[PDB]
Amino acid sequence: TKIPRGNGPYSVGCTDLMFDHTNKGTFLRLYYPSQDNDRLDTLWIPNKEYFWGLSKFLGTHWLMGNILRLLFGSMTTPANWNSPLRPGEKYPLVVFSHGLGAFRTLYSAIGIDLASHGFIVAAVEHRDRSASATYYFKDQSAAEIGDKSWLYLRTLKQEEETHIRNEQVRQRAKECSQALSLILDIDHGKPVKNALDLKFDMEQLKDSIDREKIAVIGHSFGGATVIQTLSEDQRFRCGIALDAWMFPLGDEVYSRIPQPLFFINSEYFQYPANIIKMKKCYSPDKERKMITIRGSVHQNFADFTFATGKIIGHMLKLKGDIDSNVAIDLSNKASLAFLQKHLGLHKDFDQWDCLIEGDDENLIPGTNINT
């Protein structure tokens, strides 16, 4: 309801796709240009179990899950649920990777804005136990019945963090690559039975993808995921890391990323041990850009920044000093200029090329840490 509408001229639809039905299958939320703009009715957090998972992630208990559920269980996001895909054009494609404790529906302000500018967005739900919650089906009959097996976030010990975070980032990159293969195979006529029964016929995606114009975007854990996925999969032609959390990455990735990479940071999250890993990606033979959104916190990139009032938002660290709409517009506009530049798009996003340089009252070129 306070999650902003896309600023672009396309109307936006949304659906969910799970294939195959198993814990090793792909689960994603699709944002796309819709033919028609009938009602902004997409349910933001569609199952009680995500609220239960958010509560466990936050360190609270059962009452917190029910409180979040009471507060946000009927909150919508501004996209036409299961609206037909707009025909007649091949769309560039973004694969989006969520942060630790998030899941596929929590970056709709970004997904919806990109889609309103003519992108298809596949927001993946990771099954590495980094999502607060996710689900899959133990067999085709459980899928037919809607009999969901839930998987909740894994809490780690200290001695575990180094090994398990790196295993999770590797699974995450496999899941981004698999999600892309799923969309590309559908684009080229692979018959798929969605494990979820929804009005959106996935045959509409046949011959709807501009297969040369693929990018990967992600927040926090998903920013590390951008870098791992780029190093393994040359089908992704550039990456945008939103407040990348660099800890999970092994030292081998930094030399292994030919594609252009854009770091969009919050002012109040970053720290030298994290920033120094970002600088390790820099090379004179490669395009790396970094900007910092002045007055932003980590949560400015995710949908909970639009979920509360200005005052509660500041106390819970969901909002920064900057206005949440001003911050997301800067991140989305700079993203669009970067995607036009490195995917070769024939649109007008280059009007924001200056935001890539950090040339704005609310942007810092590079970083406040050491730029």
UniProtKB/Swiss-Prot annotation:
The active site is at S220, D243, H298. N-glycosylated. Macrophage-derived PLA2G7 carries sialylated complex-type N-glycans that hinder its binding to HDL particles. One of its GO terms (molecular function) is hydrolase activity, acting on ester bonds. Plasma. Secreted by macrophages (at protein level). Induction: Up-regulated upon monocyte differentiation toward macrophage lineage. Its EC number is 3.1.1.47. Changing D243A: Loss of activity. It catalyses: a 1-O-alkyl-2-acetyl-sn-glycero-3-phosphocholine + H2O = a 1-O-alkyl-sn-glycero-3-phosphocholine + acetate + H(+); 1-O-decyl-2-acetyl-sn-glycero-3-phosphocholine + H2O = 1-O-decyl-sn-glycero-3-phosphocholine + acetate + H(+); 1-O-dodecyl-2-acetyl-sn-glycero-3-phosphocholine + H2O = 1-O-dodecyl-sn-glycero-3-phosphocholine + acetate + H(+); 1-O-tetradecyl-2-acetyl-sn-glycero-3-phosphocholine + H2O = 1-O-tetradecyl-sn-glycero-3-phosphocholine + acetate + H(+). Changing W62A: Impairs the association with LDL particles. Changing H298A: Loss of activity. Glycans are attached at N370. Changing D233A: Almost no activity. It comes from the Eukaryota. GO terms for cellular component: extracellular region; high-density lipoprotein particle; low-density lipoprotein particle. Changing S55A: Activity is higher than wild-type. It is found in: Secreted, Extracellular space. GO terms for biological process: lipid oxidation; low-density lipoprotein particle remodeling; peptide hormone processing; phosphatidylcholine catabolic process; plasma lipoprotein particle oxidation; platelet activating factor catabolic process; platelet activating factor metabolic process; positive regulation of inflammatory response. The keyword Secreted applies. Keywords: Asthma, Disease variant, Glycoprotein, HDL, Hydrolase, LDL, Lipid degradation, Lipid metabolism, Phospholipid degradation, Phospholipid metabolism, Secreted, Signal. Belongs to the AB hydrolase superfamily. Lipase family. It is linked to Platelet-activating factor acetylhydrolase deficiency: An enzymatic deficiency that results in exacerbated bodily response to inflammatory agents. It can be associated with several disease states including inflammatory gastrointestinal disorders, asthma and atopy. Asthmatic individuals with PAFAD may manifest aggravated respiratory symptoms. Lipoprotein-associated calcium-independent phospholipase A2 involved in phospholipid catabolism during inflammatory and oxidative stress response. At the lipid-aqueous interface, hydrolyzes the ester bond of fatty acyl group attached at sn-2 position of phospholipids (phospholipase A2 activity). Specifically targets phospholipids with a short-chain fatty acyl group at sn-2 position. Can hydrolyze phospholipids with long fatty acyl chains, only if they carry oxidized functional groups. This is Platelet-activating factor acetylhydrolase. It comes from Homo sapiens (Human). The lineage of its organism: Eukaryota, Metazoa, Chordata, Craniata, Vertebrata. The chain holds residues 54 to 424 of 441 of the full protein.
